Amino acid sequence: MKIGCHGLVWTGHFDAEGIRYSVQKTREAGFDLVEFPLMDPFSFDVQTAKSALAEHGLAASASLGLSDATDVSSEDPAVVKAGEELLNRAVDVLAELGATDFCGVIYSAMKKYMEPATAAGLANSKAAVGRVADRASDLGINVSLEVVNRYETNVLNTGRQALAYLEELNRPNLGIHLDTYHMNIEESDMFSPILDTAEALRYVHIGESHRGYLGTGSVDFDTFFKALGRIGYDGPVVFESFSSSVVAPDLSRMLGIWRNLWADNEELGAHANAFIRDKLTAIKTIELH
Amino acid sequence: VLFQGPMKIGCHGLVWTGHFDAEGIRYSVQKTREAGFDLVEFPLMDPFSFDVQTAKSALAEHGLAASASLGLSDATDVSSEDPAVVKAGEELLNRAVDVLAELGATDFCGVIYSAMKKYMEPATAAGLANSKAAVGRVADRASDLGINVSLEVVNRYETNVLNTGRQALAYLEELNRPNLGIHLDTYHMNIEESDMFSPILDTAEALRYVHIGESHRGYLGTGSVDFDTFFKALGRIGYDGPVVFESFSSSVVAPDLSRMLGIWRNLWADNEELGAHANAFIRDKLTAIKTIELH
Amino acid sequence: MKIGCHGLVWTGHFDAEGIRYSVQKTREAGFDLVEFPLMDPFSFDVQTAKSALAEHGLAASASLGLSDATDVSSEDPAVVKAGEELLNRAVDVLAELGATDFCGVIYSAMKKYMEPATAAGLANSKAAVGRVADRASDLGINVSLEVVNRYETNVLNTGRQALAYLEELNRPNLGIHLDTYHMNIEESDMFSPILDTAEALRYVHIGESHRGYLGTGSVDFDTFFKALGRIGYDGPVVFESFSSSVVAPDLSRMLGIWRNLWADNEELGAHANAFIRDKLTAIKTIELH
Amino acid sequence: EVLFQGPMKIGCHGLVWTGHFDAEGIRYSVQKTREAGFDLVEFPLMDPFSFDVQTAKSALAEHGLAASASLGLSDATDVSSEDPAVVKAGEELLNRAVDVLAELGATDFCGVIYSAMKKYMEPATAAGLANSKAAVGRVADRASDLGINVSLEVVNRYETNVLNTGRQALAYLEELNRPNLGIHLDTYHMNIEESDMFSPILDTAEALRYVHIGESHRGYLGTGSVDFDTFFKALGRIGYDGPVVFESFSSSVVAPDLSRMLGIWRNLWADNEELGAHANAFIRDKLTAIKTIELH
Numbered sequence A, C: 001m002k003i004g005c006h007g008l009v010w011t012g013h014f015d016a017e018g019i020r021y022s023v024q025k026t027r028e029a030g031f032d033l034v035e036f037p038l039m040d041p042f043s044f045d046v047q048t049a050k051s052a053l054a055e056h057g058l059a060a061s062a063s064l065g066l067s068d069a070t071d072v073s074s075e076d077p078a079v080v081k082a083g084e085e086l087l088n089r090a091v092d093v094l095a096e097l098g099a100t101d102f103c104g105v106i107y108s109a110m111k112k113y114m115e116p117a118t119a120a121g122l123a124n125s126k127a128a129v130g131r132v133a134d135r136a137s138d139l140g141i142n143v144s145l146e147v148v149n150r151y152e153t154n155v156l157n158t159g160r161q162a163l164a165y166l167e168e169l170n171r172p173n174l175g176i177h178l179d180t181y182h183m184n185i186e187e188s189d190m191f192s193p194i195l196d197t198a199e200a201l202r203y204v205h206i207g208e209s210h211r212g213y214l215g216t217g218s219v220d221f222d223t224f225f226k227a228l229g230r231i232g233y234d235g236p237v238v239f240e241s242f243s244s245s246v247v248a249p250d251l252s253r254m255l256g257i258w259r260n261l262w263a264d265n266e267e268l269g270a271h272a273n274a275f276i277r278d279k280l281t282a283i284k285t286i287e288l289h
Numbered sequence B: 001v002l003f004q005g006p007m008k009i010g011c012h013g014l015v016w017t018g019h020f021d022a023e024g025i026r027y028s029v030q031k032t033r034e035a036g037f038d039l040v041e042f043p044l045m046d047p048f049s050f051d052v053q054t055a056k057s058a059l060a061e062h063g064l065a066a067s068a069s070l071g072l073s074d075a076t077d078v079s080s081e082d083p084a085v086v087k088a089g090e091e092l093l094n095r096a097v098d099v100l101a102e103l104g105a106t107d108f109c110g111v112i113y114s115a116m117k118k119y120m121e122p123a124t125a126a127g128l129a130n131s132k133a134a135v136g137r138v139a140d141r142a143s144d145l146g147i148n149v150s151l152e153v154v155n156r157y158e159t160n161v162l163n164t165g166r167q168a169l170a171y172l173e174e175l176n177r178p179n180l181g182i183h184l185d186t187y188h189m190n191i192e193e194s195d196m197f198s199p200i201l202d203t204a205e206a207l208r209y210v211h212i213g214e215s216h217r218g219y220l221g222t223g224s225v226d227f228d229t230f231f232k233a234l235g236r237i238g239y240d241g242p243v244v245f246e247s248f249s250s251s252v253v254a255p256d257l258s259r260m261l262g263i264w265r266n267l268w269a270d271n272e273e274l275g276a277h278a279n280a281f282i283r284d285k286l287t288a289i290k291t292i293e294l295h
Numbered sequence D: 001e002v003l004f005q006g007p008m009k010i011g012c013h014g015l016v017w018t019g020h021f022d023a024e025g026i027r028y029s030v031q032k033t034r035e036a037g038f039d040l041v042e043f044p045l046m047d048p049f050s051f052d053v054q055t056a057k058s059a060l061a062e063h064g065l066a067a068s069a070s071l072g073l074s075d076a077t078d079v080s081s082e083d084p085a086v087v088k089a090g091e092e093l094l095n096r097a098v099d100v101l102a103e104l105g106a107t108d109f110c111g112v113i114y115s116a117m118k119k120y121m122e123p124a125t126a127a128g129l130a131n132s133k134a135a136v137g138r139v140a141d142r143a144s145d146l147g148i149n150v151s152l153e154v155v156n157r158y159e160t161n162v163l164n165t166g167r168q169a170l171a172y173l174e175e176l177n178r179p180n181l182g183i184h185l186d187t188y189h190m191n192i193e194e195s196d197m198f199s200p201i202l203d204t205a206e207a208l209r210y211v212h213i214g215e216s217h218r219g220y221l222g223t224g225s226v227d228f229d230t231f232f233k234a235l236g237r238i239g240y241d242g243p244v245v246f247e248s249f250s251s252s253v254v255a256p257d258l259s260r261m262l263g264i265w266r267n268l269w270a271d272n273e274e275l276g277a278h279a280n281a282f283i284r285d286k287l288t289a290i291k292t293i294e295l296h
């Protein structure tokens, strides 16, 4: 169980300086893992990353969100093939890094669709995801589909939909990824989805309802962490937060970050690392006696 | 018999129908009273072709009050930098205010300060100035007709202007119009706000309209919204404006609104049970909170 | 799944009039069932009750809390036998009434112990409770041990303790009774006790944190009812509230009811009926579509 | 090392550490309280006559730690008794406790000081209440001249029959009208009696001068039913900057009288070093987090 921080706490540009900065600041805030947003994995400086991770003795993972030009839920096979080629490059980036986990909105575009998912689009997604999963299987990489809210996909809005999606592909390294931010909008409660997906849950995002400081919003973290403890979850737990103060050219506009929710990210990250770790410590004590 | 007091318990029309032709108006007015509500809220996405006579007739027959909400779009975006786009929306808003006056309604609300969509760029100072100026004109027009206007705070995916009650407060202070007020929504508050009582307390004076929605917009009490704290806080400020249920499912589709609001999922089929559940939920909540000042 | 009301919403005296009064009002507020507090089962008017239940078509159950003089968790076997004979008469009363459910603090005194439990006292309790369960069994009655808080017993304060207690007795009609008012104090959360006790959960009390109006205190009813949804619970669900305005000379003092929490019980009972039936109506829709 | 300067002291109650406050327990508890990160230790002055003040003074200076004391009366000392002998025994127990604090150079005295801390079997009587009010009014006056604040702790129905809610406590103060007399709320007891976790804070605003952070069952924080989020948010909205003191009880750490009085029947923790550090970190992190809310 590694405790991680999403790279957009620190920078929005993952050039050499941004890779080095984020890795270092992640280590300084107390985390074990940095999660690299590979929005563009074709231009991600793997050498700078492997060097920075080794220096700070830190682990890496990667998340990603596709767009209109790379939508695998598209009925246009050229667009589905673009996304599958991007997803495959990211898996390659993770293999080069020696990392084990790939996750995110890799089953559709990460946007506000204006129509429902189509049956054919869903097949294209499932086929695509299955091929990525198989390719990732030979390289030692787990793939987790992130359930996100109605405004960021029209495909996987609940843990149950994710479970049905997986059940068709029945790939041994393909898992579900839950984000407390997204749960707090779409799910019926913060404990049933964790119980429901028990075996399939392989990646977790910790995010406040407005995506700022932990425990300054509407997200029921207590119920969540107690559920996680009950199914014996031992995957990554990764802080995630977005503010006007750290902008990415792509991601910040896709996630609708219009507001300043922090300025001092070194305080935000240290606090969050403390928040998650002490949540896990308290829950262990329900477990025993 | 019409309920004459100010705190009316209302239903959003989209529990009942997506189409507000004459049958849709009649179906929703009837089903709304059959559920126990005092008021129906009409989604005037198009107020130019809204059958005002049918609405008058059905409201009188069933003895029901009405209000109207609305969300703009790209062609009607008042936060657009182009005075032609701005003035298209401004004509849209004006017709809605007129439709309400004909109905004898009091309350106009919704996302009327920008398009109701997923923006890709933060707001501009120029568009912000356009929204304020136009909203200031619509409020003026409404004031002569005995209509209040309430700006609905909604989540980051539905506007890039007013995402918190604090932003709305600041927006009103600039315009300083006596009939312009704030409209909060528990669904939206559950995303953007810090907690469910601070928005109520900060907004106290300006809170004129409230929407009751579960976190996923389904059945009340099957999601993650903290209704207890919200209602307790409403009772602490002695709120007595409208309180209106709001729910969307793929069962009942609007060609426009269902797609703008991202209703991909089926959350209920039986809307008679939904509306009846929600009426009791709101009214029993209000009944319980009243007992707290005594114990 | 009958939805019940505790008798002290209506009266503190279960003489002929009290019995008739409590049965009438329970039905007028909309309940299916009235739970009689059998503080003194020897003097309970069974005939008036059977009369009143049939007149208003209402089901019945009974609850009870032992006192110092009847403490089956005593080391004094004369006290233990007084307690056993009182429990036995209560079981008898339920048989005559034609009821199925007996519940309450029947494994110890209901009081503020000034000493931890003794091993000798714990063994007295289990053996007495076992005999009452055996007796009850031949009359088709379930016996449900109510988990209460640290101030009302020193024996069974959590569902986990109740399960371990049951494990040693292995009686087929012995179950656990949970009260939200008590869980809100002693339990780690409102779902995990339900899931842990699912087999043996046979009776439920619905009470606010201060025992007044439902939804005017600190109890997490949402998580509670959703957990009951998860395990398929369909035993009795009974409203329980206490106020200065309805006094039971014994029970009001034992429970520490010092405050006015309601003056008009007719509104209170109607509200609590709607509240519970509406929680259940909504939870049913979570399960499927 | 160095004494925390300001008023908002993050403290720890002594029964996290030990149940006996002879010289050894005082030293043990002060050292561990500083070790876990706290600014303050609250001594349970159940018996203030036999309290070793000079040892206390030593340990507090050595470890750079502030102090306060809490206390709960009993049958023999019930200042809400109608027997004036019993009220006097209480008033003289309270007075010595006042005195120990002044010797320590403390500022805060709190606890269940308006009655016995027990499960009463009868409602409060008008005569007892009269005794309680006048007697507390005197202990407050006496404490006033010494620079001591006196905070009445609101506790649940099973531990008193006088002050079970914030509103009751207000009406008690309004009748005494004493400047140094204040209210002490406890999230554990609030979780039972109050209407919610923010109204008692908003209602008590002025007179709120002491705060106990205890979980619903009184073990680790964040492993129970207490709504800490709303509570700390409400603290932030009123600008509260008094003490904030952790409080936990487990059968691993037993005081002869107190642990029985409070019904500590269960084992809720054993490694109290980790508990205190966890609790300290919990409170400071909560207060950090909530200070961000005004800005956003």
Ligand SMILES: O=C(CO)[C@H](O)[C@H](O)[C@H](O)CO
Binding pocket: A036, A037, A038, A063, A064, A065, A104, A105, A110, A146, A148, A152, A179, A181, A205, A240, A255
């Ligand atoms: O929470 C998320 C978006 O709503 C996901 O983690 C994103 O896919 C991630 O930020 C991409 O790097």
Ligand SMILES: O=C(CO)[C@H](O)[C@H](O)[C@H](O)CO
Binding pocket: B042, B043, B044, B069, B070, B071, B109, B110, B111, B152, B154, B158, B185, B211, B246, B257, B261
């Ligand atoms: O909640 C809303 C949309 O998110 C607003 O109330 C809309 O304006 C409404 O649904 C349209 O009538």
Ligand SMILES: O=C(CO)[C@H](O)[C@H](O)[C@H](O)CO
Binding pocket: C036, C037, C038, C063, C064, C065, C103, C104, C105, C146, C148, C152, C179, C205, C240, C255
């Ligand atoms: O909750 C209870 C006592 O605290 C139980 O319901 C009692 O056994 C009941 O009130 C007595 O009939």
Ligand SMILES: O=C(CO)[C@H](O)[C@H](O)[C@H](O)CO
Binding pocket: D043, D044, D045, D070, D071, D072, D111, D112, D117, D153, D155, D159, D186, D212, D247, D262
């Ligand atoms: O919370 C308390 C009891 O529940 C009070 O603080 C006690 O009186 C305290 O432990 C006595 O020192």
Ligand SMILES: [Mg+2]
Binding pocket: A146, A179, A205, A240
């Ligand atoms: Mg995420």
Ligand SMILES: [Mg+2]
Binding pocket: B152, B185, B211, B246
């Ligand atoms: Mg709304």
Ligand SMILES: [Mg+2]
Binding pocket: C146, C179, C205, C240
């Ligand atoms: Mg009970």
Ligand SMILES: [Mg+2]
Binding pocket: D153, D186, D212, D214, D247
């Ligand atoms: Mg305390």
Ligand code: NA
Binding pocket: A184, A218, A219, A220, B190, B224, B225, B226
């Ligand atoms: Na929430």
Ligand code: NA
Binding pocket: C184, C218, C219, C220, D191, D225, D226, D227
């Ligand atoms: Na609670």
